[PDB]
């Protein structure tokens, strides 16, 4: 009959939106994760560059240092 | 046959309240998203920072490289 | 009517999520490569303020 299909396919409707909602929650799930890795490697790259920082103020530390003692060496000579 | 409508109306409302939690989802997702970018411009002025700051210490270690090659010339 | 297009919104929007989310891990990449020549850049330098230690060192010892 009609009415049986009619029905059945009502169902199969919405069935359909439901999927629909749901591989869209799914794909955002997705994002959700691999943002989550992103920001993990970014923090790690922070770190990364901090240490960085330091050891780079040390050099700059040292180069002051020896430009202060090649300063006088050439007030020497 | 008014069941017939409530059950419609049933339906309904759980699509409704599954639309609804994928709006908040995808919302707290741009907010997120908005971090993410924010932190992302941070650290590229860091790393910006960074660059020039051993850009200026490369050509500092150059001239005093070459002071010395001057200063070791005279003996 | 407010179910099957509130839908195809959503995707939309969250098809430009993902292009969004592609260009942010390409500019994470793009900054892990500047890490390394960072590093690389960093140890040479490093190299180099130690041989000028030792050559002010060398000058030092001729006085
Ligand atoms: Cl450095």
């Known amino acids: 009959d009609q009415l049986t299909n009619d029905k059945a396919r009502v169902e199969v409707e919405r069935d359909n939106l439901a999927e629909d909602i749901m591989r869209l929650r799914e794909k955002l799930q997705e994002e959700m ?21 330091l050891a780079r103020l040390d050099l700059e530390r040292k180069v002051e240092s020896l430009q202060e003692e090649i300063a006088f060496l050439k007030k020497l000579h």
Request: charged share 35%.
């Open 33 to 53: 994760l691999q943002r989550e890795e992103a920001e993990n490697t970014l923090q790690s790259f922070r770190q990364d560059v901090d240490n960085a920082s």
